């Protein structure tokens, strides 16, 4: 089984004990490490942080300690947008420019593969034709990687993609059956199901729907997402179940109603270290004092509230439950966003180093 872990190149700017660099990564924790995020310049893969070239070397240097470890570079993310992907996939010439720049870049910096994190083809401004052009891009990359492995004798570069769980996004941009044949694995983002963009509280990553949910709402859960990707043609062994080491927060319309689905007025207070209203790292929630934690019976995940703050997150128990689930479905393993959001240095939760991801490793093994 695979344990795919995302590293983020901006965590290096967090203050104090929250700062995360390649030196903070446990070489033996995961089977695959994915570096987020690379960008694109004139249809060619490019760095996004001033010191990426140096970080790339340290990152792939982890393989000197654990030779079995595989690394990949992820391109995209939310802030990257969609325009550059749309323009690049528009013509065969532009796609070749990208594909060849990707091979060179990955070989130059010693990455074992490429992870596509376009958010998303067919959505967020990307036109309908991008659903099929994304398929062409994936085919172009698979073809090129196969060819390069053959001409160079080197191990074939891996190709994966971080894909959405929401039916709306999946239908608008992914020909699942087609792309699945060309991807080595699929990183299912089985999280971000609910967030402060919604007017009521909801859990970031519920395993199942609430009994009272119906319609489209009843599909905003992990089980529905997994069933969807399998039903549309994804080989179980290629479906890697994403797990979040962070939660999503809301400010309540009233401290008197702290239920799942209670009216909310917007994002919860930004965390002291992550500083992003609407989310909190596991290490920012695991030790909340004077708070009240409760488990959502039907969804098998917890939430915690204090005064007018409400946060739905994942803990050791929910991660255990989800791995049992993925094993029961025969999935290819677990994926996690992100290394720097777990209590990596064991400074906050009194649960040792990487309490959440270590749980994934132990449960998978």
């Amino acid at each position: 089984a695979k344990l795919v872990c995302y590293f983020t190149n901006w965590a290096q700017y967090r203050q104090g004990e929250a700062r995360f660099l390649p030196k903070d990564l446990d070489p033996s924790l995961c089977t695959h490490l994915i570096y987020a995020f690379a960008g694109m310049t004139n249809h060619q893969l490019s760095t996004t942080e001033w010191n990426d070239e140096t970080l790339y070397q340290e990152f792939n240097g982890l393989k000197k300690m654990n030779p079995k470890l595989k690394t990949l570079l992820a391109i995209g993310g939310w802030n990257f947008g969609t325009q550059k992907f749309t323009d690049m996939v528009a013509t065969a010439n532009n796609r070749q420019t990208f594909v060849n720049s990707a091979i060179r870049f990955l070989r130059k910096y010693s990455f074992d593969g490429l992870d596509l994190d376009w958010e998303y083809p067919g959505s967020q401004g990307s036109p309908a034709v991008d659903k099929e052009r994304f398929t062409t891009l994936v085919q172009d990359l698979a073809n090129a990687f196969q060819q390069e492995a053959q001409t160079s004798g080197k191990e074939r570069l891996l190709l994966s993609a971080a894909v959405p769980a929401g039916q709306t996004y999946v239908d608008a941009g992914y020909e699942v059956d087609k792309i699945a044949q060309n991807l080595d694995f699929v990183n299912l983002m089985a999280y971000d199901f609910h967030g402060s963009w919604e007017k009521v509280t909801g859990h970031n990553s519920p395993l199942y729907k609430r009994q009272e949910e119906s319609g489209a709402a009843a599909s905003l859960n992990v089980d529905a997402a997994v069933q969807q990707w399998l039903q549309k043609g994804t080989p179980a062994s290629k479906l890697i179940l994403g797990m979040p080491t962070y939660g999503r927060s809301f400010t309540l319309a009233s401290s008197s109603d702290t239920r799942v689905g209670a009216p909310a007025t917007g994002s919860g207070t930004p965390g002291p270290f992550t500083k992003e209203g609407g989310m909190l790292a596991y290490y920012e929630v695991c030790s909340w004092k004077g708070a009240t934690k409760q488990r959502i019976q039907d969804q098998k995940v917890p939430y915690i509230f204090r005064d007018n703050q409400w946060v739905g997150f994942d803990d050791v128990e929910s991660f255990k439950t989800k791995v049992s689930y993925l094993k029961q479905k025969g999935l290819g393993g677990a994926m996690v966003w992100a290394l720097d959001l777990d209590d990596f240095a064991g400074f906050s939760c009194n649960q040792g180093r990487y309490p959440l991801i270590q749980t994934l490793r132990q449960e998978l093994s």
Binding site: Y6, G77, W78, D117, E119, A162, M189, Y191, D192, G195, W197, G242, P244, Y246, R248, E276, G278, M279, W337, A338, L341
Partner: peptide, 5 residues
Amino acid sequence: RXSHX
């Protein structure tokens, strides 16, 4: 937004 998105 806030994480992977």
